[PDB]
Amino acid sequence: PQITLWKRPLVTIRIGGQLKEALLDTGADDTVIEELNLPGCWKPKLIGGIAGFIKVRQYDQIPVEIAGHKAIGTVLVGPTPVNIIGRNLLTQIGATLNF
């Protein structure tokens, strides 16, 4: 699929058995998902944005379907305002920028 950028590139994802909306963010190194009691063990991390940092829970080897495409990798969980799919998972689904 091709996604134009007139509006925010929001898509449906599946994680932990739950469906969520997420932003495809080529400016994010990592994937950051809203408060969700994701089973399994996690560890602390701090991640930075434009204004500062937030504390998140790093979970590894988490299956995540993005627009029907299976991926599996690291998911950071915390009080992000927007669920974000970053490059760690975008690469797994073969996503490119084209112009």
CATH homologous superfamily of 1-99: Acid Proteases (2.40.70.10)
Alpha carbon 64 to its chain's center: 9
> From the CB of residue 62, how many other CB atoms can be counted at a distance below 10 Å?
20
CA distance 74 to 32: 9
User: Which sequence positions are flagged as catalytic?
Assistant: 25
3-state per-residue secondary structure call for the chain = CCCCCCCCCEEEEEECCEEEEEEECCCCCCCEECCCCCCCCCEEEEEECCCCEEEEEEEEEEEEEECCEEEEEEEEECCCCCCEECHHHHHHHCCCCCC
- What method did the depositors use to determine the structure? X-ray
CA distance 23 to 15: 14
CA distance 45 to 29: 14
Let me know the angle formed at the C-alpha of 6 by 5 and 11, rounded to the nearest 5 degrees: 55
CA distance 24 to 80: 14
CA quadruple 65, 70, 75, 80: dihedral positive or negative?
Answer: negative
